[PDB]
């Protein structure tokens, strides 16, 4: 475990898979007797595990609560595992790829899975809409431009 | 001594991950509105 | 009071899937101004194909439809074709097996492959309210059809 | 319409079953928006 | 049968959706050193809610387990609830539509939200036979008989 | 008699319902195949 | 959301959907029979469209014709577009920015909307292994004309 | 080719890269020997 943030590094999928999937409606009858949206409301959770030397299995858990007025719609919970090859990076540059650019890969299929789980109770669409954390990490650490001149091009 | 590249025991997951809470505005409406089911 | 067919029927199951899926959004752009009230309905398109003997593609091509007057809110379809191995199938109950079970078979695969690409197209996506075209038939009918059912039983 | 199979018909004891018409209500939750991603 | 009137008897649907979907696979990355031969378990249970006078819930737990010898590769158990506001029945014929027909018509929901589970965890898709014990108890009432008669056109 | 079923009541096991033996002819065992593993 | 033309740098993520998708299972059932790896051809192509000052939607394209033996296994396509708040921006990074990084953000949701239809078509899941395209081409930018502002702006 | 730093016309691409595709592995054959029902 290294820590100045200056190495070529190197990222490998192996595979992709949902893991858990959960989706408990309570008072699922109950939505017949309740005339209005469910406060479907997100979660996220970072659980992580090794299986080997430079081979990491990253488990995006998004959970998410739901609830008819003053009473639980239903509960909802995925968890999109993903086996990823991760060395090089190191403190900042691993801390970027683990916490953002590893769930941005598991984000889509983990939407997918739970707006699906959801709709199956006859409820309406809540998928997560994506955040551009590199974009805020380039001007965090600020990264710049090529500073110099520019060109135009004609044709 | 020691092998392998750096890994990790999951050191604080990125400078934070805010998200929003809930919207959309839906509704549902038994009498020939949506999301519900008026009897088949 | 009940004229026998003698109908045996020997239903298998062989393998389901989405044969063509399609998502059309022209005004994607657009619906950020657009009036939410469309006419959200599902549209059950029965076709089949011969692949051998007693080995039959029945291929339902579920359409759902979100119209706002002359502003469209989305169009998805899933022809979701469904191989099925039957022979012995007579009488009503061939009408009713391969005319409505069968295409019930491969409606939730195709309906849930729709609240995907809806949801998919950030629109309000939905499982839409079963059709229970059975539940009606049996209701209607004309006649009593007859006291086949009238039997207490043994062990 | 017609047969794909050795037997296949379906016009008499075949009823329309309902195609479903929910409506959406009227006007979505487009102005401020509290569902997008503002943050930058 | 000069008696052409319906009885206290119905039929009726008010809702089918998911009151509980549930996928594990705890050697999910444990499952690639293992040999790929799935050994299929279903287990078939339901249970029955009252909701109002007249209008009850039966809620089909499918179990859907699939192990590589004594290693669990996943497992996924859906309860495809469904509401029927029915009256008038008793005797044989009512354990025979509760404890067959009524979970029949939630079965390929329940196969499918199952199905799309088992996909979504890169696994291959398995289709759960439906098991014809309508047409097995008919054997014993009156073997077979299907006189249709068209009528009641559409509503 | 009848066209419908509500509440529960095991009065009595009627009948045998075995199930399906859910016993088929393999799958794809893996095989040591490669997608290339490296990205950058 | 609601950004104007007066500040520096911006890059926020307003709405990211498919607007085009298409699933084509031509030899369906005959690829069933036919058992081997499908050998997909994965072809890239971006677009744009101005919706906005410093607002604009990039659309990726992201094909798949999957083939096997002699004939063709399915077809693929989903045309991910993506709404952007840029601005600060200029020269190659503005190009760059337009041509890689944006296409990259919608990369996942097109990889992920072809898995699901691979698999709910019930074929292998069909992940493309996340390559940097960016960070590949960045290095060429700060070694070459393009960007402005003049070097050598360092103590 | 002709951009300037504010924008531009999609007269054609320019950042196009070969993806690294699939390769031959092996992941096909789901079932063959199908289980049956009973006779019903």
Redesign the interface.
């Given at each position: 475990?290294?820590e100045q943030n200056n190495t070529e590094?190197?990222?490998?999928?192996?595979?992709?898979?949902?893991?858990?999937?959960?989706?408990?409606?309570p008072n699922?009858?109950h939505?017949?007797q309740?005339?209005?949206?469910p406060?479907?409301?997100?979660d996220?959770d970072?659980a992580?595990?090794?299986?080997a030397?430079?081979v990491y299995?990253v488990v995006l858990r998004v959970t998410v609560t739901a609830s008819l007025g003053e009473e639980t719609a239903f509960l909802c919970e995925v968890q999109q595992?993903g086996?990823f090859?991760?060395?090089?990076?190191?403190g900042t540059q691993?801390?970027?790829c683990?916490?953002?650019?590893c769930?941005?890969?598991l984000?889509?299929?983990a939407?997918?899975?739970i707006?699906?789980?959801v709709?199956?109770?006859?409820?309406?669409?809540?998928?997560?809409?994506?955040?551009?954390?590199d974009?805020?990490?380039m001007?965090?650490l600020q990264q710049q431009?090529?500073?110099?001149?520019?060109?135009?091009?004609?044709? | 001594k020691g092998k392998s590249a750096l890994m990790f025991n999951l050191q604080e997951p990125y400078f934070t991950w805010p998200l929003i809470a809930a919207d959309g505005g839906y509704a549902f409406k038994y009498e020939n509105g949506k999301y519900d089911i008026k009897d088949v």
């Open positions: 475990m290294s590094m190197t990222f490998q999928i192996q595979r992709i898979y949902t893991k858990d999937i959960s989706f408990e409606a699922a009858p939505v017949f309740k005339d209005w949206q406060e479907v409301k997100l996220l970072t992580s595990s090794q299986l030397d430079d299995e595992g086996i090859s991760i060395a090089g990076i190191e691993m801390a970027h683990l916490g953002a650019y769930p941005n890969i984000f889509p299929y939407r997918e899975c707006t699906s789980m709709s199956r109770g006859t409820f309406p669409q809540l998928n997560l809409a994506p955040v551009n954390f974009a805020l990490f001007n965090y431009a090529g500073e110099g001149t520019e060109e135009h091009q004609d044709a | -």
